[PDB]
Amino acid sequence: FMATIEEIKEVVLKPYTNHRQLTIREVETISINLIDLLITKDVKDARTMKYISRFLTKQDYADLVQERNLVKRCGYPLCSKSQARVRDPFADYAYLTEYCTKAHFRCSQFYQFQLSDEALFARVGVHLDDYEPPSEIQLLEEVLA
Numbered sequence: 001f002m003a004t005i006e007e008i009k010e011v012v013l014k015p016y017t018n019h020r021q022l023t024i025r026e027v028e029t030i031s032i033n034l035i036d037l038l039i040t041k042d043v044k045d046a047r048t049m050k051y052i053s054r055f056l057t058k059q060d061y062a063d064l065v066q067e068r069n070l071v072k073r074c075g076y077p078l079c080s081k082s083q084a085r086v087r088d089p090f091a092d093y094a095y096l097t098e099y100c101t102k103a104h105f106r107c108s109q110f111y112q113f114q115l116s117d118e119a120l121f122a123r124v125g126v127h128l129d130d131y132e133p134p135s136e137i138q139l140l141e142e143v144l145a
Protein backbone atom coordinates (compact mmCIF):
# COMPACT_ATOMS: atom_id res chain seq x y z
CA PHE A 1 0.00 0.00 0.00
CA MET A 2 2.35 2.74 1.33
CA ALA A 3 6.15 2.84 1.58
CA THR A 4 8.08 2.49 4.86
CA ILE A 5 11.74 2.43 5.98
CA GLU A 6 11.58 -1.38 6.21
CA GLU A 7 10.36 -1.70 2.65
CA ILE A 8 13.02 0.69 1.25
CA LYS A 9 15.74 -1.40 2.94
CA GLU A 10 14.31 -4.54 1.46
CA VAL A 11 13.52 -3.39 -2.13
CA VAL A 12 16.22 -0.73 -2.62
CA LEU A 13 19.15 -1.15 -0.29
CA LYS A 14 19.26 -4.94 0.31
CA PRO A 15 22.09 -5.72 -2.15
CA TYR A 16 24.40 -3.13 -0.66
CA THR A 17 24.11 -3.83 3.09
CA ASN A 18 27.59 -5.43 3.22
CA HIS A 19 29.44 -3.09 0.85
CA ARG A 20 31.88 -0.82 2.38
CA GLN A 21 32.05 1.27 -0.74
CA LEU A 22 29.72 1.89 -3.63
CA THR A 23 30.51 2.59 -7.24
CA ILE A 24 28.88 5.48 -9.08
CA ARG A 25 26.64 3.01 -10.92
CA GLU A 26 25.41 1.38 -7.72
CA VAL A 27 24.61 4.84 -6.25
CA GLU A 28 22.66 5.71 -9.41
CA THR A 29 20.85 2.34 -9.21
CA ILE A 30 19.74 3.20 -5.60
CA SER A 31 18.29 6.60 -6.60
CA ILE A 32 16.48 5.07 -9.56
CA ASN A 33 14.96 2.26 -7.54
CA LEU A 34 13.99 4.67 -4.75
CA ILE A 35 12.33 7.17 -7.12
CA ASP A 36 10.51 4.32 -8.86
CA LEU A 37 9.19 3.11 -5.48
CA LEU A 38 8.02 6.61 -4.57
CA ILE A 39 5.94 7.01 -7.76
CA THR A 40 4.23 3.60 -7.44
CA LYS A 41 3.54 4.22 -3.72
CA ASP A 42 3.18 7.13 -1.28
CA VAL A 43 5.25 7.50 1.87
CA LYS A 44 3.42 6.20 4.84
CA ASP A 45 4.54 8.42 7.65
CA ALA A 46 6.82 11.10 9.03
CA ARG A 47 9.58 8.73 10.07
CA THR A 48 9.91 7.33 6.58
CA MET A 49 9.85 10.85 5.05
CA LYS A 50 12.71 11.85 7.38
CA TYR A 51 14.64 8.68 6.49
CA ILE A 52 14.29 9.38 2.66
CA SER A 53 16.09 12.66 2.85
CA ARG A 54 19.47 10.99 3.17
CA PHE A 55 19.02 9.61 -0.34
CA LEU A 56 17.76 12.85 -2.01
CA THR A 57 19.38 16.01 -3.31
CA LYS A 58 17.25 19.05 -3.80
CA GLN A 59 17.19 18.33 -7.57
CA ASP A 60 16.31 14.62 -7.15
CA TYR A 61 13.39 15.77 -5.01
CA ALA A 62 12.19 18.23 -7.69
CA ASP A 63 12.41 15.42 -10.22
CA LEU A 64 10.49 13.13 -7.80
CA VAL A 65 7.72 15.71 -7.79
CA GLN A 66 7.67 15.85 -11.61
CA GLU A 67 7.58 12.06 -12.06
CA ARG A 68 4.80 11.84 -9.45
CA ASN A 69 2.75 14.42 -11.30
CA LEU A 70 3.11 12.39 -14.61
CA VAL A 71 1.30 9.51 -12.88
CA LYS A 72 -1.26 11.93 -11.45
CA ARG A 73 0.03 12.13 -7.87
CA CYS A 74 0.37 15.20 -5.72
CA GLY A 75 4.04 16.12 -5.62
CA TYR A 76 4.29 15.77 -1.83
CA PRO A 77 5.26 12.10 -1.29
CA LEU A 78 3.04 11.64 1.86
CA CYS A 79 -0.06 12.48 -0.18
CA SER A 80 -2.32 10.02 -1.98
CA LYS A 81 -4.28 12.63 -3.95
CA SER A 82 -3.58 14.11 -7.42
CA GLN A 83 -2.39 17.55 -8.11
CA ALA A 84 -5.43 19.78 -8.24
CA ARG A 85 -4.94 20.71 -11.96
CA VAL A 86 -3.66 17.65 -13.82
CA ARG A 87 -1.97 18.81 -17.01
CA ASP A 88 -3.99 17.64 -20.03
CA PRO A 89 -1.79 16.79 -23.12
CA PHE A 90 -4.68 17.62 -25.56
CA ALA A 91 -4.07 21.29 -24.76
CA ASP A 92 -2.52 23.38 -26.46
CA TYR A 93 -1.77 29.91 -9.06
CA ALA A 94 0.95 27.77 -10.61
CA TYR A 95 1.57 25.32 -7.66
CA LEU A 96 -1.86 23.72 -8.25
CA THR A 97 -0.36 21.97 -11.28
CA GLU A 98 2.04 20.09 -8.94
CA TYR A 99 0.16 19.81 -5.62
CA CYS A 100 -3.36 19.11 -4.40
CA THR A 101 -3.38 22.32 -2.25
CA LYS A 102 -1.32 25.35 -1.24
CA ALA A 103 -0.61 23.62 2.07
CA HIS A 104 1.12 20.68 0.25
CA PHE A 105 2.99 23.19 -1.90
CA ARG A 106 4.39 24.72 1.38
CA CYS A 107 5.08 21.37 3.07
CA SER A 108 6.95 20.36 -0.06
CA GLN A 109 9.06 23.52 -0.19
CA PHE A 110 9.71 23.23 3.58
CA TYR A 111 11.05 19.71 3.09
CA GLN A 112 13.08 20.57 -0.05
CA PHE A 113 14.71 23.60 1.53
CA GLN A 114 16.31 21.28 4.06
CA LEU A 115 17.71 18.72 1.65
CA SER A 116 21.46 18.81 0.87
CA ASP A 117 23.00 19.45 -2.53
CA GLU A 118 25.89 17.09 -1.65
CA ALA A 119 26.03 14.41 -4.28
CA LEU A 120 24.79 11.05 -3.11
CA PHE A 121 28.07 9.52 -4.14
CA ALA A 122 29.81 11.93 -1.61
CA ARG A 123 27.61 10.85 1.30
CA VAL A 124 29.98 8.39 2.99
CA GLY A 125 28.19 5.25 4.15
CA VAL A 126 24.62 6.51 3.35
CA HIS A 127 23.69 3.02 2.24
CA LEU A 128 24.54 1.63 5.73
CA ASP A 129 22.23 0.90 8.63
CA ASP A 130 24.58 2.89 10.91
CA TYR A 131 24.62 6.16 8.90
CA GLU A 132 24.03 9.35 10.91
CA PRO A 133 22.53 12.31 9.08
CA PRO A 134 24.00 15.70 9.74
CA SER A 135 20.71 16.88 11.22
CA GLU A 136 17.16 15.85 11.64
CA ILE A 137 14.88 16.95 8.89
CA GLN A 138 11.69 18.74 10.03
CA LEU A 139 8.25 18.17 8.46
CA LEU A 140 5.63 20.90 8.35
CA GLU A 141 2.21 20.10 9.83
CA GLU A 142 -0.49 20.66 7.20
CA VAL A 143 -2.55 22.68 9.61
CA LEU A 144 0.35 25.19 9.85
CA ALA A 145 0.91 25.26 6.12
Ligand SMILES: [Zn+2]
Pocket residue numbers: 074075076079080081082099100101104
Ligand atom coordinates in the same frame (compact mmCIF):
# COMPACT_ATOMS: atom_id res chain seq x y z
ZN1 LIG B 1 -1.22 16.61 -1.70
